[PDB]
Symmetry: D2
């Protein structure tokens, strides 16, 4: 009972490949009102709609040097319906610079009773009609984030099962409406676990993910995967080289991610702008066969300096945009293993 027709499969596949074409990556500017609020706070800027619009504008309209580097940009509901000073709808700006428009459809995480502070995420209700509308309004791909944390007894079996399953429902509903789903099963770096531990959990989680995607009949060629890189915990005692985490990362992926998956867009999760870039570069230089595109889907790792260089002053637009264009170009190079800090 084919879940998708050949025509639909092709549309999803084309979209997926376009997003991660050589040297291209994703700009994750989908911070919700609460998330972006923290951001604006860190630079004494009031969290108003106009301030948010101006900030998203600031990033979405950087000069054309960023064009070949940005294959896609994820937007939050609000932004998708905002406009730039020139009146053009943001989705149009993004599309005019050669990027695909992405929309976050998840409605945050919720607590999983009976577990040690673990979560699952919501947002499935009326998701189909939502995707159909987002499709009409310019979006071609979506993003749904699930969160797992490494600890004594985590991720628990329940956590792994339920989060993999919900990611599948999400992907299924998306592809039904011609939207390429970015499956994001992020494993928080929090904790003091070492490299091996992370590579272990990542492998188990990733395996549970694709089995789910399979049970739910999802078309892998029309998907993208936004995982955490394999790294030691933020509070880990041991120290590792970029080569090591690049090796642990590509290895973990080589034994869980089917080659049909069009591409992997790494989340920087806490890494510094420079760090995320160096690692992405090491990953593409890893002495192992990589059957899928290995690029970026960065949020802070792309907006850090820019936000800081903006400080909320309109007179800083240029200086701020330059920071973003700087990181975007750096990461575009890392996606090809040619980044030379």
């Amino acid at each position: 009972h084919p879940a998708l027709t050949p025509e639909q499969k092709k549309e999803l596949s084309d979209i997926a490949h376009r997003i991660v074409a050589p040297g291209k990556g994703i700009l994750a500017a989908d911070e919700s009102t609460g998330s972006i609020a923290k951001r604006l706070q860190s630079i004494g800027t009031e969290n108003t709609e106009e301030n948010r619009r101006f900030y998203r504008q600031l990033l979405l309209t950087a000069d054309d040097r960023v064009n070949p580097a940005i294959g896609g940009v994820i937007l939050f509901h609000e932004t998708l319906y905002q406009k730039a000073d020139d009146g053009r709808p943001f989705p149009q700006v993004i599309k005019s610079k050669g990027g695909v428009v992405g929309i976050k459809v998840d409605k945050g995480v919720v607590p999983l009773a009976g577990t040690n502070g673990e979560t699952t995420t919501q947002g499935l209700d009326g998701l189909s009609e939502r995707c159909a509308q987002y499709k009409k309004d310019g979006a071609d791909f979506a993003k749904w984030r699930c969160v797992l944390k490494i600890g004594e007894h985590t991720p628990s079996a329940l956590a792994i099962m339920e989060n993999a399953n919900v990611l599948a429902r999400y992907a299924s509903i998306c592809q039904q409406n011609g939207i390429v789903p970015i499956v994001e099963p992020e494993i928080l770096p929090d904790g003091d676990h070492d490299l091996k531990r992370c590579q272990y959990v990542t492998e188990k989680v990733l395996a549970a993910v694709y089995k789910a995607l399979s049970d739910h009949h999802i078309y892998l060629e029309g998907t993208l995967l936004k995982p955490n890189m394999v790294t030691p915990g933020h509070a880990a005692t041991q120290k590792y080289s970029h080569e090591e985490i690049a090796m642990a990362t590509v290895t973990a992926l080589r034994r869980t991610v089917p080659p049909a998956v069009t591409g992997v867009t790494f989340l920087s999760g806490g890494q510094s702008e420079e760090e995320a870039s160096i690692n992405l570069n090491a990953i593409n230089k890893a002495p192992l066969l990589k059957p899928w595109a290995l690029t970026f889907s960065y949020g802070r790792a792309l907006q850090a300096s820019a936000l800081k260089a903006w400080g909320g002053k309109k007179e800083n637009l240029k200086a701020a945009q330059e920071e973003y264009v700087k990181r975007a170009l750096a990461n575009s190079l890392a996606a090809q293993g040619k980044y030379t800090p």
Copy 2:
């Protein structure tokens, strides 16, 4: 990592037992605006809010003979916030006659891509804050309906897995807010399959349900189960006695439903008022050990004659209420195996 405290478990258990105490059952008057619309249509009555309020009032205020028969009544969101002519909030009327207030929290079924017309159901989004509010406003138990259909290749493994899993999320979220969850994995009678076939699928589904409930750490003593009775398909050629379907039903339940489950509230799904009563009676007379309460959670099987005797005329209130009181008393007796048509 206890999902519930002893105090919480006790509250859920007490509520559960109260609902199915000897001779008591549930009145499922939770038809949504769309469902009840069909109902009103069948008697040339406009589907207005007042007509709906009057109808729910009609059933909720029948004379006190219905008191010992009604352990609980399920309401739709709207009704839970409506009032009787005397100004009392419906939840109060229900509670003053000795019944527990129930609230439907599911938001209907949605299609499962890649399957042969199968479905899962939505309503998890913000369900926790919803239950917390419903708790404050009088509800002590909830109901979420999942639908499976017997056919050539149905229920498929995916259908069984996903519906059992969502029922578990639902139950988990409920118990967290002091709400007893009624798990309803209804297997439509549609089709031409025979008794054996139904007993087979029901056993598989029910087994998948409780394993899920277990993985999600749900407290069985604080739950109720609203299943379909095991019966041949509506278009089945073969014919069966009440004793036979009573035997097939109690048997299917004896090998899937842990004795800890406080009670089973049968859905009449298509049966006539008299039929549902005779079968419920046969089930309680089945020559097998039944470790749980075996009663009713009827919608049409309790409202059929009443709705028809009402026809929309205010002057029929009495005649209409008498029909309901007639069926409620009959079913109260069936729940004790003392129904003598």
Copy 3:
């Protein structure tokens, strides 16, 4: 595709009920050559075949007072083909005193790679032809032991999954040859965990067991369950009353074991003869509805004093047999909750 015919189901059911009929239990004299070797060692007795035969004879031929107490006795391969001094084949002695003959078919535990010292068990190879032969030679039921240990990260998901699945294969093959399978998913008492912890793991394990039994289409009415009672770890600091462990035990069972399961035959696993008897008695006195027979399937708890009173001297036959008859009668009473130490 019925795995069993009505005729086969009835034979299995009948056998199952006979074994646990009121006041009856099981004598587990199935110690393998290696196990019984430890036993004989503890009383300075050489581990020869004759010594083994004499010992099994000693227990299998105790006076008839043990008849109403022994519903069945499990034998090791060797014993099943040995004879009493009077030339009668052991299975005949057992059958002439009113007991059903049981045969252990598992071939011990094996290590599960990648786990923290966990195991699964083997014995499936050629099991079908083995059961067919054992059936012809007098056996009507079998026993297969799986072992799980409570610890930091145990039982792991893999351990629970694989052991529940192998128990199912075993049960399936048995019922195919008219042999009632005793499913024994023993959770070692080793460790310092408390009551709650044990009740928790037992519930999870038991839930995983029956889901498996269901996936493998096994007929529950033709099965028996040999679980560990729920008790604190041997090295647990906290102390509990018999009532408490009886409550934790019946509770854990009420929410995992379908009422269709003909009966539960508790393994004493380490408890003293008197202890196992007092607890079994408390379990049958537990203020909760027990839908299945709650009796014993004891090894040491039935042979302890006898083996000690035998010391290997033929002149002690009588004194030794009296000890066994003493415990068997005590446990027969415990299975009815009438044991008064």
Copy 4:
């Protein structure tokens, strides 16, 4: 809890790569006494040990042209301990021509109760000590065959679950003894299903396989996969080109087989010698990225003409060997996509 040490992983990986090195494949001469019996029958040759030894000798000692084409050869227990006329133990002959010695360790298929003629396979009992012995006697890799059949209700969920799980146990036990496991989840071509249907079932089965391999902590780099190519059923009405089945095959594999799997050794299952060669060639020419070696592990597709040209006459040794060398060279070329019939 590392199931393997770095030293062990390396040994397994090295062995795996050696077997499928460029242009090399496997000769599956592991027919059991019953299988090979059918073979000898088809050419009026008595099934004696000597006849079997002579036949295995005939294939194992073909001239050195076959050396660069044969990366490994699977043997049945008997053969592994037989000797060539010159006294050299067969494992030595195989090893002296540059091939790795393989041993079949499965003990055939067994019926799965409650299913529509489906099976699982046995052979786990004492498998560990068996592998340890086989390792000492020259074998470095093993083979275990599972069988699934496409039909109305097959493969059933149970069949897929149990066969994937047993393949995992098998693999686990192998790697523990330094033996590279060849996982063979063959889906019989029997039936009248079309290409799509086969690609569908193969994808589901293969997905279930690797999730299992993951749950059992198996090291993928130290494994090989012997699947069926994706083809229409033998009795399928529709007709397909080699390109089509090559596309359906590589596609099904690209979305289930992690790139870490060292290689895929296709079973010819019913295809003619020429057919299996043309398809293997088409597969390596498929316009899709293949991250693993795509070669052969043929039984009949390598022995067909040879057995026929032998007819049992010692005077045909040469003519018979030439047929085998002809196919082995042809397939070696197909494994590199250079086969030009």
